[PDB]
Symmetry: C4
């Protein structure tokens, strides 16, 4: 069966959310109260504390800067690291809503749709899910492998400064006793701090894909029940309000995370464009800086695209049922379809801490701001 295949994938997503050290909540397939184990709790606490102290050493390493170039070289990695920290806190706080969200993915079976549509819907869902997940995973692995292991192959196979950008430490970390084990520590902390927000964006993309498929199924079900008494309309309205409650749940955690993400990502792409444009770099960091740019652009573009698709499917749900049969229906249908339309006129939008609406036009406005500040930072030299 194809459907049990879908089961596999959502279990994998839950597994990855417990690999990178998020707080363990109840998965739908788990029914032995396994998430309350201490063996998985000390894991998440250890990884969260390690990420916190690494981000704090990097953040106070920024304020103790030598010049402008070291400041920007700290700005990029500290931006990504505090993105990871904001994501850690936001998944720590709202643990209960994630269980309801994963229960929504487990069963979402729409009633009233023709049976020929569900198969192609499941195939498109699995294809797009596999695409976004493997894309972000492979780009993350290549970027980490370059940025972390490329300077090690210059010296460790056989003077100082193995890592690309230094940070604040209580130890000296310049002598040969300490710098290698600092590099190893930075490697494993880099693994976890990269793995957390990528997994969060993967889960958000899965949720948006499922909500798009659900809204298309709802529109087809409205057309099917109008082509043909009350109970079908009650089930339609209940699915339409369940979708709205689910998006209202998704709004909060990703509101805080998206505000932090978008601001620090704009800072990171501006600093990267300055490093690639002006300063005569050492050419061993061009394959890192040309992959971090593509990762940032791909992540922002995928988030904005899957946030625009949901609003477009809601507005497409507004035009559902409007045909010649609606004129010939009773007063009951002409009232409930009117109610469904005037509720569907309100768009389902994910806002970033209510400062902006995550759309595709916001990507164009932010790219304009990035171009302006890149021109300014280039002129300042």
């Amino acid at each position: 069966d194809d459907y049990i295949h879908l089961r596999k994938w959502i279990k994998r997503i839950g597994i990855i959310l417990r690999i990178s050290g998020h707080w363990p909540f109840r998965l739908p397939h788990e029914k032995r109260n396994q998430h309350k184990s201490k063996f998985r709790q000390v894991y998440s606490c250890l990884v969260i504390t390690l990420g916190f102290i690494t981000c704090s050493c990097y953040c106070i390493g920024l304020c103790l800067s030598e010049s402008i170039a070291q400041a920007l070289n700290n700005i990029t990695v500290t931006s990504y690291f505090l993105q990871s920290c904001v994501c850690y806190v936001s998944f720590i706080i709202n643990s209960r809503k994630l269980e309801t969200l994963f229960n929504y993915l487990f069963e979402n079976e729409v009633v009233g749709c023709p049976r020929g549509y569900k198969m192609s819907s499941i195939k498109t869902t699995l294809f797009r899910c596999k695409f976004v997940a493997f894309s972000l995973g492979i780009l993350s692995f290549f970027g980490w492998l370059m940025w972390t292991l490329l300077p090690l192959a210059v010296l460790v196979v056989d003077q100082t400064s193995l890592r690309f950008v230094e940070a604040w430490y209580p130890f000296d970390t310049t002598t040969s006793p300490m710098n290698e084990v600092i590099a190893i520590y930075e490697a494993v902390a880099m693994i976890f701090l990269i793995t957390a927000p990528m997994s969060s964006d993967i889960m958000f993309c899965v949720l948006m894909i499922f909500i798009v498929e659900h809204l298309k199924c709802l529109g087809m079900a409205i057309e099917c029940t109008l082509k043909g008494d009350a109970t079908s309309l009650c089930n339609i309205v209940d699915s339409h309000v369940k979708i709205y409650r689910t998006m209202e749940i998704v709004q909060s955690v990703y509101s805080s995370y998206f505000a932090t993400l978008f601001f620090t990502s704009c800072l990171a792409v501006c600093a990267l464009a300055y490093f690639l444009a002006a300063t005569s770099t050492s050419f061993t960091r061009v394959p890192g800086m040309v992959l971090y740019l593509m990762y940032i652009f791909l992540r922002i573009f995928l988030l904005c695209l899957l946030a625009t698709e949901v609003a477009e499917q809601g507005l497409n749900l507004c035009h559902a049922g409007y045909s010649s049969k609606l004129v010939l229906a009773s007063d009951h249908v002409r009232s409930t379809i009117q109610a469904i339309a005037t509720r569907a006129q309100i768009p389902l939008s994910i806002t970033g801490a209510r400062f902006f609406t995550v759309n595709l036009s916001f990507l164009a406005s932010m790219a304009g701001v990035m171009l302006t500040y890149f021109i300014v930072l280039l002129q300042v030299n």
Copy 2:
């Protein structure tokens, strides 16, 4: 009882609005026609005239500037002072509407809500009220104490220019006979001119908190009356129209005050960022200039947040009642819920003299404008 506690707090707000010299109007708890006393009227007239002449000496002290730096050092304090003057005039003119607003806070008892919700609503209201009031009060006291008493401890405990920025005066004010009593006069005028707009923003924050709680109570009451004849719907519509009339009353006074506030606050934060960035300041004004920045950002952020919450609660009221029961109701309910929704689609927004809508996105746009003009003013040196 908790509820009588709320009584205490609104009385305190009225008391503070008569301490800082606003025009005395009838409070709800007062029932002896006490507000028409001359003993409280000559107070407000004396304080308003003193604030007017102090703001006028500061304003014509700006045009008689020596250079650019003295001009900006006048620009900050004159911006805050004419904010205070605009607030004084706006509370002088519309005295009658403030009585209806304080009568709205005295009794606002929603009918039809389940009894278990009102307790937590009152607790959240008291907590957020105490938070915003004590926050702005303590920051104002620390900022005034620094800016006014820190230069006095250099000289008065034992050459000229005790105050930080000079102003126009008919007296000489440079000689030792006059400068000390000018400093004392500036201290008490500083107390009143700081105390007025902070108290106005505290009252606006109280009103927005109460309107948010009222809208949430209305949504819960709609859900409760749909879960269960006409009279409940009439009471719901009457509460919904009373909220709209109250916001329409709040719109005007704070429209004029918010236009003045936002423009002069942008000017003040730009001039402060220039003083903190470039000019080698004397380090005795860094604790003043680093608290005035935090006060400005906190005040603007709290105003924008509590103006966004009301619009979000209105749009959340639009989605109320939409469920399976609405399909099974009569024509009467399906008409009145439709009317409530198509009225709730119009957002309750506080505009600043109709030039802009006070939202959280406006804070981002204004911060972008502040960053652009700070870059320009830094480049001009």
Copy 3:
């Protein structure tokens, strides 16, 4: 009677529209086919041709510029002159719609309003009409008197270049035979080219004031007919659709005129701010350049304010009738009030050639653009 007073004023407006040389159309009070006279037609043709040739000499005088300063000194007057020419053409083309507009001002009597409201409405209408008309007229007279007669009192009472900015001419116009009669010709052409667009803005302000009063009367009439069968609702809907047809008529002519006006006015205020800031002017043109700025700002602000008031009154008409009585009315009232509301949700907006919406926020955006280009033009020196 007060009402016949209103008659007087609209007749005066028609009279002024035929003084400045617009194409003569039928006024409401005229009933002898007087507008088809040739005695008033050769007037308008002569004045329009004179304004055309003066604007053409000024426009080709701009392209034959000596430097940047003479180019901007031509830019200001040519901007105002081609505003006048666009207004002349737009009133020449649509002569028929102006008759229907002046017939709308002649009789607009709303039915169903309480009688106590109409008196205060007429008083407020006459007050605001007199205010805007006398304000723009007196500022125009002072600006023309300064700019035209102030250099004449230096020389003509007793070497060359009497006028402030020269233009292209076939004659020499530098010798003493010709320059005085060129100055006289420029004086009378200046009178007509100033008098035309000011009269057009006065008529637009009158129309917006009347539409605001009409919408407030309609809202009060809806409240009155809901407080109390079908015929009142038919009269309400007919007045509401007549207001929309009138605004749709007003949209076109002022769309073209407002596009030209706003663009050339932004150019003029930028060039004036450059002349007042940098160049060491001769101080005999400071009273002209400081009145032209105030006239431009006052005209733009009054147009934007009276365009925002109409949209606000439409959205206020959306909330009319919504009360406890609407729940207790029949199906007929609950359907027609719903229809009135869903039609009133569409805003009555005057757009400038569909490029922008004339609001008060547009004034803030245009002022930001003016500040940016003033900073650039100051930096270019």
Copy 4:
């Protein structure tokens, strides 16, 4: 008959779409399965491959640039060429939807309209169609003739570098054996690569004109059927939903094409304004660069105008039927007119890959961006 005349014109449009080498689809007048011929398929494949290799040589000719000036001189032509390539791909992919679109133009006969309106509608349609088609065709022919044949008349009638801007080639192309035949090849490739997107914009303009006429006919038909049972309303709703399906079909292909078009057109007009402003050009390319500017501005303005007209006609359809008769109709009419209005409130907008809405305000925003980047590129020299 006039109507058969319309037939002629749409056949001509189909003919031109098969002249410039687009993929051949079934026209409405063709009924012998002529579009599946190989004689017309190898034509389109040959022209598409030639345009691809020419665009690829120009695109890799950009990256192998000598300086900034040669880079911009490549940027303009490569922008137009990749516009042509994106249009080629977008017409290759969606071949099936173009058949339904051309079947919509073949028969669109509205039922219920008064007969006196259709004649003037057809006359206005033919006039505007002929205007836009002949305008873009004549400007394209003059621009191509100038840019391609003007340097040939300097040398070929009787040292190197016949073409204006060079490109990458495997051949030498500088010697006299090869440069002439390279110029001939560039001439014919220039013909096809210019002829494709102009024909696409002509078809889009035809579609927007027809949709505007259809919406006006629908509004007049609503007024006519309200002036007078169910079947007329069913036909009205079916025409209104057919218009929406047609615009939803038009959205996709022109979404991708409009995104590419608008971005590369902004780049091209910025580079052209730099070439015309600063660099001492050879004056033989001023008649080319002053026609390419007018072509770009005319094309963008016509696209934005005919995209704004459709949204304005939809919002005008929202106000249809609202009169005194609607109050006196049955419940059926007052429900179906309400449904038509609440569906017509959603605007029919053509978005460019969902990044922006093609309006006339977007033209103003893009012109502001063009002015800013032109000022920057002028300052960089």
